[PDB]
Design a protein around this ligand. Structure first.
Ligand SMILES: Nc1ncnc2c1ncn2[C@@H]1O[C@H](COP(=O)(O)O)[C@@H](O)[C@H]1O
Ligand SMILES: OC[C@H]1O[C@H](O)[C@H](O)[C@@H](O)[C@@H]1O
Length: 466
């Protein structure tokens, strides 16, 4: 007989092993490409007193109206503060684009407490190159001194044309007189309260003041030299495409970018580079559909509940979509299988609060251990806010494993086989499952997702190398 306390012990043991497995496998990974979104994250830790004053100055009325009538993008200070309060009320990760110049000035005056690398590729770069020491090539749309220096020391590189020769240099050695792409990040803890609104869960509002990543502008090197860049890596992780709109007022379309991305995938595939897509929520239906059609060209995809559900919705499975959005684990599993049926993709990594899943056409415990590694990395990132040394991830071993997910696994054993803890066989697929490590009082919430997907993908690959 295997009880709950025994199960708690068993996961502690598998967590410890996995961390060791990952450590030994990571040095095998010979290069990762990361694209396309890199920016600056300007982090403010909200203050009740300060926030209230600001709302009050601009007009509390208008601000409170905006909480109920949320715009699509920020065009005034009211809509900014409305967006922030809304984010607090709903305890929700939100991000709105800042079109207004006057607001950008307001954002910069209001300032920040901490400056960190930003964007999905950027955050992943610091982690993979700086913490894991995997040689990393990263797309950086604009590289002024302030941008470049947020990169930690290590094998992090940007491609640069010198003659016909393409060189790989550290970002601090490719500084140009270009734009600061600032994302303003407003973190709040569980129970944060402003006026009569209290936060149910810890989250952040992001006021996105970044005109380049908005349209996915690519550097010369990536447009003209993608092939030479590709010869340098074994892995690629692609993100940032969720921003794309079907139409722009300037007559351009999403197709301009996706045709380009598809060429990249064709090149990646010609070199047998394994690629992972972060399929962030894509508001534009037509674009979401186009992204789904690209999925067969990727090796792997990462997603959460609303992402999985939004995908189910466009292939015409609304019953399943609603159930995924309701958090029903067996519905999540069916959605992953449907997605794999639709696309033939090798790997789907799903993450939510308390547990991860990975569905794969291939087999092995490496899939599970990578989920476990990533779970620790996520926990460590939440504790420390920003990661710097792989040994800091060892600290996450003492964060308790989510007890609800441990119990949930009993349900998985009854429904599916389970040949090993957290490991399920299907006829031509394997399903890995992991109870995660939820940090009660996190230092920051930005970048946790990035840490999850990239950590599982790269450590899995490393561990699977024969
Ligand atoms: N306090 C926390 N501790 C550990 N993991 C977290 C915490 N908050 C969020 N996460 C993880 O980070 C993910 C956020 O990913 P996403 O919502 O896809 O950007 C969640 O799905 C969780 O798995
Ligand atoms: O993953 C966190 C990142 O997600 C999004 O790209 C945000 O716009 C960016 O500010 C943040 O750096």
């Amino acid at each position: 007989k295997e009880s709950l306390k025994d199960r708690i012990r068993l996961w502690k043991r598998l967590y410890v092993n996995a961390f060791e497995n990952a450590l030994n496998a990571i040095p095998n990974v010979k290069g990762v490409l990361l694209a396309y979104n890199t920016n600056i994250d300007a982090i403010k830790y909200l203050d009740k007193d300060d926030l209230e004053k600001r709302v009050t100055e601009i007009g509390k009325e208008k601000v409170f109206e905006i909480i109920e009538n949320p715009p699509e993008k920020i065009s005034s200070i009211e809509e900014l503060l409305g967006g922030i309060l809304r984010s607090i009320k709903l305890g929700k990760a939100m991000e709105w684009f800042v079109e207004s110049e006057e607001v950008r000035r307001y954002l910069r005056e209001w300032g920040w407490d901490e400056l960190r690398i930003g964007g999905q590729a950027g955050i992943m770069a610091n982690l993979l190159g700086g913490v894991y020491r995997i040689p990393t090539i990263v797309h950086v749309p604009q590289n002024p001194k302030l941008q470049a220096e947020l990169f930690v020391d290590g094998p992090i590189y940007v491609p640069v044309f010198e003659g016909n020769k393409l060189k790989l240099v550290h970002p601090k050695d490719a500084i140009a007189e270009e734009e600061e792409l600032i994302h303003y990040i407003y973190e709040f803890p569980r129970g944060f309260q402003v006026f009569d609104v209290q936060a149910p869960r810890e989250n952040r509002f992001i006021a996105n003041a970044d005109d380049y990543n908005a349209r996915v502008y690519m550097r010369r090197e990536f447009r003209e030299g993608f092939e030479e860049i590709t010869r340098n890596v074994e892995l690629a992780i692609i993100s940032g495409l969720q921003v794309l709109k079907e139409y722009y007022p300037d007559g351009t379309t999403y197709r301009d970018v996706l045709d380009r991305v598809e060429s990249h995938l064709n090149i990646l595939n010609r070199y047998n580079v394994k690629s992972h897509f972060e399929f962030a929520y894509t508001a534009n239906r037509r674009v979401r559909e186009a992204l789904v059609e690209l999925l067969p060209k990727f090796t792997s995809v990462g997603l959460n509940e609303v992402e999985l559900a939004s995908i189910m919705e466009i292939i015409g499975d609304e019953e399943l979509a609603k159930e995924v959005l309701e958090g029903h684990i067996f519905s999540v599993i069916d959605a992953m299988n449907v997605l794999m049926d639709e696309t033939g993709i090798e790997r789907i990594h799903f993450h939510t609060y308390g547990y991860y899943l990975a569905l794969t056409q291939y087999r092995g415990e490496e899939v599970r251990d990578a989920l476990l590694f990533a779970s620790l990395a996520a926990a460590a990132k939440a504790m420390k806010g920003n990661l710097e040394r792989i040994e800091q991830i060892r600290d996450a071993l003492s964060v308790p494993t989510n007890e609800r997910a441990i119990v949930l696994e009993e349900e998985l054993e009854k429904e599916f086989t389970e040949f090993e803890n957290g490991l399920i066989d299907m006829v031509d697929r394997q399903l890995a499952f992991v109870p995660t490590k939820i940090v009660a009082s996190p230092k920051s919430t930005v970048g946790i997702g990035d840490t999850i997907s990239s950590s599982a993908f790269v450590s899995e690959f490393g561990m699977r190398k024969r």
